[model samples]
Target: IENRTVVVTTIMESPYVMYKKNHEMFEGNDKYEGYCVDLASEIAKHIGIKYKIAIVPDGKYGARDADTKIWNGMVGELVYGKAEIAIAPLTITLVREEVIDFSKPFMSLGISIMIKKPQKSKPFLTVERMVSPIESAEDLAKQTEIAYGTLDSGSTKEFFRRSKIAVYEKMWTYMRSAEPSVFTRTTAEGVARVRKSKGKFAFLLESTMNEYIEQRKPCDTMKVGGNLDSKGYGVATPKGSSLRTPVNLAVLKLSEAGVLDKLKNKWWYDKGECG
Candidate 1:
């Protein structure tokens, strides 16, 4: 609502906000596309404000370091007043809301388990199919043949860290002390590890990421079991900003009118290898 152009924070990810193949030839927002980019355009048009898309410098979603007492990632941009709003796949959680405002969620998702697709025997080798014995979190918890982990800093990590559920608490303890270091800074690296581990690793992450990557080329991975918990992704603004109310309404309006539904389909299915 300020008279000047607003600065909107975001992060790069598949089917959310990604650099164009020819991105170097373009400049600013034009260089990016995918779900969040589309959502940002709709919100800006509905709210009548100009905003520039700025990537979070650290590339993490946003989490507070307990030792430093500082917020890092997109949420920090808003907390420190560097960006007025953020339109991304950022989740709306209690801790995040303590320092920032979030619009009604534009998309709903939850934690999921990802596993390498069991490799089928080669064409001339009798075409045997191999199925993984692991099926859910229970399996991951009960066995050590497959090592699993989550992103280093994000709601997913915080979920297990804060959860009091019996099984999850044990899993969290295992993850916190995993000697080989199960955490990865970027989702891509986690996926890469799963690919290379030859069914010896699993990556726990958001279902949206699972759905997109499973349908991608090579198609060597698949989401297993149901989401551990449910949540939605919402836009964020610093607390008490004039933009919060309007942005909230704008998000609800788009969702109500189905603009968000259509945009999600366009990016998540239509563009990303048609999964």
Candidate 2:
């Protein structure tokens, strides 16, 4: 809204927005780099405004705490007006929308279960007794204990923690109360635990990250649930800001020209999910 260059906030998430080995220059798209990076650049170009990247730290607490002085997270920067806009992958939730205005979502995904492969086939007596409503693969994806992942943070975490559903909250309650502890510190850490434990642990991560992992040389994990839930990533701005319209228009333009799809394929699918 002001004539100043917009301070665009983001996080250094891999395969989406990771710094190159040099840590000075970027590594994804040649021009701007990464999914959110490229998307932000396109929006800037479309809106004819100069912008700066304020990189947030990688952790659950930092992203949600508006009181922190750290810029490596989203909550504080937008709340304190340190940043004029946020192009980060911050989920569009009703609670977040109260403090920040979000553009139309640019991507959709949900938490998924990923246990060790051999253990996947092991049947549980209690599990069979629980999943009576599941009638199809999609239903199983949603209701069964075969897959699960805890929230990354904030509302998503709270929602899962407080849910009364047998599959969602009950699983968390069991895992947390289990003898050895089933929780993880980060999504990638959970994936690593699954790989090393040989399916003893199943991790829930973003579908985009999950697909990227599948492209690796010795890919072993599989995404086997309905998208645990679906929501889009929006361009977040401080409430009452005027930049929302231009940013939304830019996003729509990218979606129409197939540029957004192209970026998604380049980063996510093996050769673009076609051939």
Candidate 3:
């Protein structure tokens, strides 16, 4: 492949990738830093290409719509051809993989149930399988003790809000009308509520973040009972971008050298303050 600048699309996801004091540089380095940035750098070096970062905004509808005014969001940039590749935590979904090409997954994570470390039995990890025989939304509506109170942002929130027949909807139907009830707020607020309530308030967040919180001091929250679903994070590229080969190879190299795990632990395990 000819040497060319690879325009990698990313999002403003903190600790993964973010801006430095409103600067154009990526958060980890002078102009770019973090696990993704470092991985991109290593990949670029291996493939003999110059790297450039394009910061995308975090928005659901914005990413799906090509006409969105936002220059960055993953799908919007890819659809508009503003980026040659994307290394964000874009989940591999059937609907998305059809339109975009994804490389071998760089990491795998899941939707986990985060509960303050005192609950006797949290619903998030057990609710689905335990109540699997439920055939009607009404059947799910009879549960006791509301399970979760996720923040009103990110993919998790949207998934539950828009679901119809899946476990999320079934669970939501129960929570929205249950006694003692489920609630919604920001992540920080939800964590606070759980901490204060002493296991009464479980939270639904990314497994990565839950792992992050559990490592910090006064570690009260733990990712209980395995993940709801397992999915991988991959490098997204245009349908026929020539850069895909080098990028894929680079990722394989990272995997062999254990760089991906190193990055995850650095961001989630080694850093951050939990109170």
Top lDDT prediction, candidate number:
1
Higher lDDT: candidate 1 or 3?
Answer: 1
lDDT of 3: 0.68
TM per candidate? 0.83, 0.75, 0.73
List per-prediction Cα lDDT, in the order shown.
Answer: 0.87, 0.65, 0.68
In the range 127-241, model 1's lDDT, one tens digit per residue, is: 7557666878887888866688999977789889998888888889888878889999888999999999988889999998898898887888888988899999989999989
Clashes of each: 0, 7, 5
Which prediction has the highest TM-score against the true structure? Answer: 1
lDDT accuracy of residue 142 in candidate 2: 51
Tens digits of per-residue lDDT for model 2, 33-139: 57878787888888988777776544431344368534345756777787778787878877677667888878776665454433334445566342222333344
Shift in Å, residue 16, candidate 1: 1.8
Runs of candidate 2 exceeding 4 Å displacement = 1-4, 21-32, 57-72, 115-156, 270-275
Q: What ordering of candidates by TM-score runs from best to worst?
A: 1, 2, 3
Of 1 and 3, the candidate ahead on TM-score is 1
Q: Candidate 3 — worst ten consecutive residues by lDDT sum?
A: 130-139
